[PDB]
C-alpha cells in the first residue's frame, strides 16, 4: 500500500496509476472533458491538462494565452486518426498498442505531438524488424 | 522504460508518475487550474479532474450538474487548512506528510473528503502510538 520514501515521507505505491485510471474513467464517461481534438474527419474529447502533461505540442498550445481557451483544436490534416487514437489511449493508460500495421503512423504522430520516448521506442521496434 | 504487460501490450513504467508530476507542475504555476477550494481563511487553487480522481467528496460535487460549473467550493468551516493542504499535496504527488502534530486533522479531513486508504493509514499510525 505504502512505503518510506527516500525523503523519509510516506508514499503510496499505486496512487499515480490509480489517479490515471480515474482520469481515463472521466474521459470514457465524457466528464469534465474541455476540448475536442479534430483529426481529419474524427473527433476525440479529452482533458487539456492530461494532453499537456503527455505532449510537448499540447503543452505549447495550451500555455499560449490565445489558444488556452479554445474548445476545438484541429491537428495537421496529414495526421492519421488511428495513430492519434492509439497515442491518446497511451496518455490515459501508460499502454501503447503498437502493431506492424500502425507503427509508422504512431511514430509520425508521436513526432508531431512531441512524445519523444514513444518516438524512440517506435524507432527501436522498426529497427528490429529491418 | 517499458515492459510487456499481462495483456501482451507495451506498458511504460514511469508514465503515470511522470503525468502526475506534470499535473503538479501545472498546479504550482497556476496553469489551467479551474477551481479555488476555500478552507476557513485559506484558498487553494487546483484542477477539478485531479480533485475528483482523488476524493469521493469532490467526485460527488463535480458530477452534480449544478455544482460542476462552480469556480469556488467552500469546505466545512470545521476543516483544518493545514490538514487540507497536506492532502492536496498528497493528491498531486503520492506523498503523505503525516506527523504527530497533524495526523488527527489529516485523518478528519481525509474522512470528510472520502479518501479511505488515507483514513485507514492514519488509524494504523495512531494505533501504533497508543
Ligand atoms: C517533450 N515531451 C515529451 O516527450 C513527453 C511529454 C511531455 C510533456 C510536457 N508537459 C509538461 C512539461 C513540463 N511541465 C509541465 F507542466 C508540463 Cl504539462 C512537455 C513536453 C513533453 N510527456 C510524457 C508524460 C509525462 C509522461 C509523455 F506522454 F510520455 C510524452 O513525452
Ligand atoms: C472513495 N474514494 C477514495 O477513497 C479515494 C479516491 C476516490 C476517487 C473517486 N473518483 C472516481 C471514482 C470512479 N470513477 C471516477 F471517474 C472517479 Cl474520478 C471516487 C472515490 C474515491 N481516490 C484515490 C486516488 C485514486 C488514487 C485517493 F486519492 F487515494 C483517495 O481515495
Ligand atoms: Cl473554440
Ligand atoms: Cl485549431
Ligand atoms: Cl462560482
Ligand atoms: Cl460552496
Where in chain A are the domains? 1-130
Q: Which residues of A touch B1 (CB under 8 A)?
A: 117, 121
Distance (Å, rounded) from C-alpha A68 to C-alpha A80?
24
Query: Cα–Cα distance between A58 and B19 in angstroms, integer?
Result: 13
- Provide the shortest C-alpha distance from residue B17 to chain A (in Å): 5
Which residue matches cell numbers 493528491?
A: B91
Q: Which helix (H) or strand (E) holds B65?
A: none
Distances (CA, A) of A112 to A69, A76, A90: 21, 9, 15
Q: How far is the CA of B69 from the centre of ligand 5 (A)?
A: 7
Determine how β-strand A35-39 pairs with β-strand A72-74. Answer: parallel
To one decimal place, what's the resolution in Å?
1.8
> In whole angstroms, what is the distance from residue A103 CA to residue A87 CA?
11
Rg of chain B on CA atoms, in Å? 16
C-alpha cell of residue A67: 489558444
> Taking the mean position of all CA atoms in its chain, how far away is CA B8?
32
Ligand 1 within 6 A of CB of A56: yes
- Cα-based distances in Å from A119 to A57, A103, A127, B57: 14, 10, 12, 39
**Are the C-beta atoms of residues A56 and A115 closer than 8 Å to each other?**
yes
Give me the helices (H) in chain A, please.
Answer: 15-28, 48-53, 56-62, 81-93, 103-113, 116-129
Q: Which of A7, A30, A32 to mutate to probe the B interface, most B CBs <10 Å?
A: A32
B39 min Cα distance to partner chain A (Å): 23
Beta strands A35-39; A10-12: pairing state: unpaired
Which structural technique was applied?
X-ray
Residue A73 pairs with which residues in a beta bridge?
A37
Taking a C-beta distance cutoff of 8 angstroms, is the pair B59, A26 a contact? no
Number of Cβ within a 10 Å radius of residue A105: 18
Task: Please state the φ and ψ torsions of residue B46, each to the nearest 5 degrees.
Answer: -160, 180
Q: Ligand 4 center to residue A76 CA distance, Å?
A: 9
User: Greatest CA span in chain B, whole angstroms?
Assistant: 51
Q: What single DSSP character describes residue B100?
A: T
CA distances from residue B50 to A64, B8, B27 in whole angstroms, order as listed: 22, 29, 10
Amino acid at each position: 500500500l505504502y512505503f518510506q520514501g527516500a525523503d523519509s515521507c510516506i508514499q503510496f505505491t499505486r496512487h499515480a496509476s490509480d489517479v490515471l485510471l480515474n482520469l481515463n474513467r472521466l474521459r470514457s464517461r465524457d466528464i469534465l472533458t474541455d476540448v475536442v481534438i479534430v483529426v481529419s474527419r474524427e473527433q476525440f474529447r479529452a482533458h487539456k491538462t492530461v494532453l499537456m502533461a503527455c505532449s510537448g505540442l499540447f503543452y505549447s498550445i495550451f500555455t499560449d494565452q490565445l489558444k488556452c481557451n479554445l474548445s476545438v483544436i484541429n491537428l495537421d490534416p496529414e495526421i492519421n486518426p488511428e495513430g492519434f487514437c492509439i497515442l491518446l489511449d497511451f496518455m490515459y493508460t501508460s499502454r501503447l498498442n503498437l502493431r506492424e500495421g500502425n507503427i509508422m503512423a504512431v511514430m509520425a504522430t508521436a513526432m508531431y505531438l512531441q512524445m519523444e520516448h514513444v518516438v524512440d521506442t517506435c524507432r527501436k521496434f522498426i529497427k528490429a524488424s529491418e
